[PDB]
Design a protein around this ligand. Structure first.
Ligand SMILES: NCc1ccccc1
Ligand SMILES: [Ca+2]
Length: 223
């Protein structure tokens, strides 16, 4: 997250870190057994880390649970990033408490202009590299579809939305991928892609979760 703020420990209780020996992507806990992330975060050998603030210090509220199954969306296209969504099943159920909690799936798609909360442990610099140890947060509005399509001509599908600031300076970044975009208390986006971080006229692009609720619910009911 570039241009954000320190969230505060366990104030984003649905945020997870995906670990393969090191943090590599975020995700969101949607019930006691299942995490949503980005398909482009797929790896074999994922451990899900819940209850984290500092990812390099064991602080006492963590739960570390290995994945038993990953399911990339059937229509994921890694070239275009269309359908950039993946479900991860935990080997055992998480213990839900005030520091580890699920986020609800949406009923309706969020509206342009709504302020959302984006969070992660990704790079904090627009130019250069600095990775934080504690969770960072950013408030950013959903942009109009016409603004989004003008920023990325020929590249925006109906399964994507843009959020952020056309003037630059505040954005998600590398290492935030797969993490949550929460608007009005519901999971509306997944950190997906963009052109760099916090550059002018190049806002972040997010997977539009409201288009996938049927697939999520069917998949959970069968696995
Ligand atoms: N600035 C959007 C973004 C997010 C994740 C990875 C790359 C770019
Ligand atoms: Ca920790």
């Amino acid at each position: 997250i570039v241009g954000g703020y320190t969230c505060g420990a366990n104030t984003v209780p649905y945020q997870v870190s995906l670990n393969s020996g090191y943090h590599f992507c975020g995700g969101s806990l949607i019930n006691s057994q299942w995490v949503v992330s980005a398909a482009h975060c797929y790896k074999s050998g994922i451990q899900v880390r819940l209850g984290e603030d500092n990812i390099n210090v064991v602080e006492g509220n963590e739960q570390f649970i290995s994945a038993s199954k990953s399911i990339v969306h059937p229509s994921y296209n890694s070239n275009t990033l269309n359908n950039d969504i993946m479900l991860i099943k935990l080997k055992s159920a998480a213990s839900l408490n005030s520091r580890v909690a699920s986020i609800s799936l949406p009923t309706s798609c969020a509206s342009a202009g709504t302020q959302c909360l984006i969070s992660g442990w990704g790079n904090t610099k627009s130019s250069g590299t600095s990775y934080p140890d504690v969770l960072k947060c950013l408030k950013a509005p959903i942009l109009s579809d016409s603004s989004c399509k003008s920023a990325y001509p020929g590249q925006i599908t109906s399964n994507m939305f843009c959020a952020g600031y056309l003037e630059g300076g505040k954005d998600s970044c590398q290492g935030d991928s797969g993490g949550p975009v929460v608007c009005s208390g519901k999971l509306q986006g997944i950190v997906s892609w963009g052109s760099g971080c916090a550059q002018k006229n190049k806002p972040g692009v997010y997977t539009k979760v409201c288009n996938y609720v049927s697939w999520i619910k069917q998949t959970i009911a069968s696995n």
